[PDB]
Point group: D2
Amino acid sequence: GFLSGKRILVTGVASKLSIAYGIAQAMHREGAELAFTYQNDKLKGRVEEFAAQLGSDIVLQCDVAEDASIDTMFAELGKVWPKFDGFVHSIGFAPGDQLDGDYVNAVTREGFKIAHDISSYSFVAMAKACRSMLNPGSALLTLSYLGAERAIPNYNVMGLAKASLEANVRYMANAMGPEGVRVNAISAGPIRTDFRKMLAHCEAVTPIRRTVTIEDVGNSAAFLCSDLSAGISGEVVHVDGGFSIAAMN
Amino acid sequence: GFLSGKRILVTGVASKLSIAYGIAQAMHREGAELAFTYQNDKLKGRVEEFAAQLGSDIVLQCDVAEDASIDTMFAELGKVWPKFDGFVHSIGFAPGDQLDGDYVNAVTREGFKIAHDISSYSFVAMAKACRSMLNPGSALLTLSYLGAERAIPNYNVMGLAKASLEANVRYMANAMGPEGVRVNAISAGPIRTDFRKMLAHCEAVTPIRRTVTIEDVGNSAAFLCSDLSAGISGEVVHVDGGFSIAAMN
Amino acid sequence: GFLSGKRILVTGVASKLSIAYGIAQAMHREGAELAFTYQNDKLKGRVEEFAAQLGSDIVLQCDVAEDASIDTMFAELGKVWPKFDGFVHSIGFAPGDQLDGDYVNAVTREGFKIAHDISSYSFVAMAKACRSMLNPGSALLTLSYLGAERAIPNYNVMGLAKASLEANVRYMANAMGPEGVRVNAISAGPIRRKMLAHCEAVTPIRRTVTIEDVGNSAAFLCSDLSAGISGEVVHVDGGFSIAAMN
Amino acid sequence: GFLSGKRILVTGVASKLSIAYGIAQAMHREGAELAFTYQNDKLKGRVEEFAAQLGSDIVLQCDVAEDASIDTMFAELGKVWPKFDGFVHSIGFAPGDQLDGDYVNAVTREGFKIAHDISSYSFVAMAKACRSMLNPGSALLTLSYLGAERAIPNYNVMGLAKASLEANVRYMANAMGPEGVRVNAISAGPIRRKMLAHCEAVTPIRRTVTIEDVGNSAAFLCSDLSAGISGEVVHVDGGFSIAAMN
């Protein structure tokens, strides 16, 4: 398929309904060889199993909160992939109380610091750590959400972290392009897994009249990490069925 | 390939260096069956030859200035493709004196009317004319340029027509989505075929450090007309190597 | 006021509720001397009523569909103001058949042509026709709508004409800035029934904007207070466009 | 003036050339009563010199890196102004090691943390700490830069902090608008050597903007003249960002 020859590391695989799993499935179907991180002991087993289902036995612990953890993960990867072609960053978090109710009341200095560290800094932390390992032609990919561009109820300090993240894509694309590395994001629509009401709304007003699926997101992610997207860098691509471009439907 | 099963009409094929030809080549390589329009008698022969090189003998006259011409073209197409899966609009024109020097001096009411009629109206003219022919899952694609979003010297009334065109993508995506049709544009970077100086500039400041090629544009176009981009509609995708997202390089 | 010593021509005043009246009123309050256009002779006395309230008796006929009418209107204006400091463009039309129902079904080649010619091309037509009359320090302002940026049901081909108008603002600003002219627009929010109900509920400031609010931003954007702003589409819609799923 | 009967707190006045001084000056000219913060005691007399020229003796210490300092600063302010009408946030910092050379090489976890905490989080920290003190009609303003939108060489991690700041503006506007508070920013152009040379040559108005131009837009954006504007990033860079390849 259109990723044959490519080795891509996938972060954030959680369950078979997670976007990262939809991306890993798509990439695998297109011929990539994959490697996977897991955060901690609770998730290790499920990730090993899913990795093995998609032909891989490269399953490595990584906590992106820690610079040391990122480095030793890449040291391990390099024993099997001295060079590789990019990675998929699907990691985003804010403490739970950040995301409920009025933004100005909910946000705190520490909730801000964590959400930005985990959801934005970790993308460039990973790049810094594997930079010399990336072949010419590599592509980095992160996931974002409309809350970066619009104020969405409850999304709160995650909007600011995703906005930081999308500027990180541009700064990274600009810095890394001359060595032959592209860096893009997908701004994914809400995916059916307060939520019920937001989904009903979103299907009714999306031009394609349905929420995107993890398969849809996976196919766009495979494209953006393949040589087929050689012309695209620093771009936030909306994979939300046109939801963001309509108003008052 | 990822377009097998798809029938796509390609407009604007001119010479082997034209974006539309790069798109038709890419689509063909991915398995689509193609049909081609030609504007007039001068171009017919070259289009017939290129069509035949990419497996097609569907070569039909169409002048998008005329509603009658569009209709009879689709009447002919329908004798061989009673239904089909979309088309690529690569048609854009302004009278030559529109594009030289100060915009406010150069623009005229008639140069404005032509550039908007040909470069923007014709996209929805084509959609209106084949709407009932499009299968669920179809995708329409047009080409645009950064001059839609920024004031670029000399591009002049073409910027306004491309801006009209990109709003046409959104209005079309919104109207057609519920019947299962997506509508997108590619905003393509300058392609190496005042021009010399603009190219040197553009390679030096583009993150990927080169101009995009018609192959790069073709691959993104194939993606956007394929089921792989099922999640994307109403979107203007930048295929300019990150050129638009950097500043002062 | 912050427009003292400014002469601004105002188009599109058709009634006291119109956006262009709210703008003229604010400009007059801030010390501008005003002039007005009208299109057909039926409206002429009514515009003289308006101009009189806003301190002016410069009321001139103009049909912006015609190059010669725009030219003769600026020759007339030139008799009272051989130089002036810019104009407000508030003129936007599509035939009514364009603005109802499915966009792709509704739009025609002629409806598209009229919408762009009248709502976008007229803005640069006016600038071309008065270019040598504008002082250094001048400012041109037009009015747009969120339909330029998003697909809004029914707004249809007007969405494309306003997207052309906004690009027109940028290309005009880029061409005229070196002579010392700025060019901007205000994208105004809806102005006061299901659509207003939605709008009030979801706009950050919880109300629709008024012609007074729009008039106040326009006055700023045509005054030297906004000397650092050119080529800009300023959203005066209470924040409606930056929110989603409120 | 158009700020008569307004009380605005101004942060970041460090010298007479600073953007925040140009803003305070314009606000004072338009009739606002002002208050100022300073960070360390070394700068205190110098800020009292400044405040005195702009009509004020409300000069208060605040280190926005610390929640308790922001709290005690608003308690002090509360002794003279138990209610007031908003503030200007002009505070932006990254360690100097962040702002040189290749972005990906330069940026560290700590440099990222400081840049966002000081340049973006402090804006909502201040709002949280004075929320109940703000009158209906109030306005908060911060300062950004085109680096939030585009990758500019050397600006590095500050580009990400300003992109967070701009989103902060939208989420603040959405949360505070229903209480009657607007929140906006100005993305200011560079202010007066190779980079200025480029900038003057390619900006539509053919000059860099001055602190006076920025001060005039800020005054507007904190006055009731801009009552229709919230959640908006207004570009005050002479049109530089809307042009390409000039």
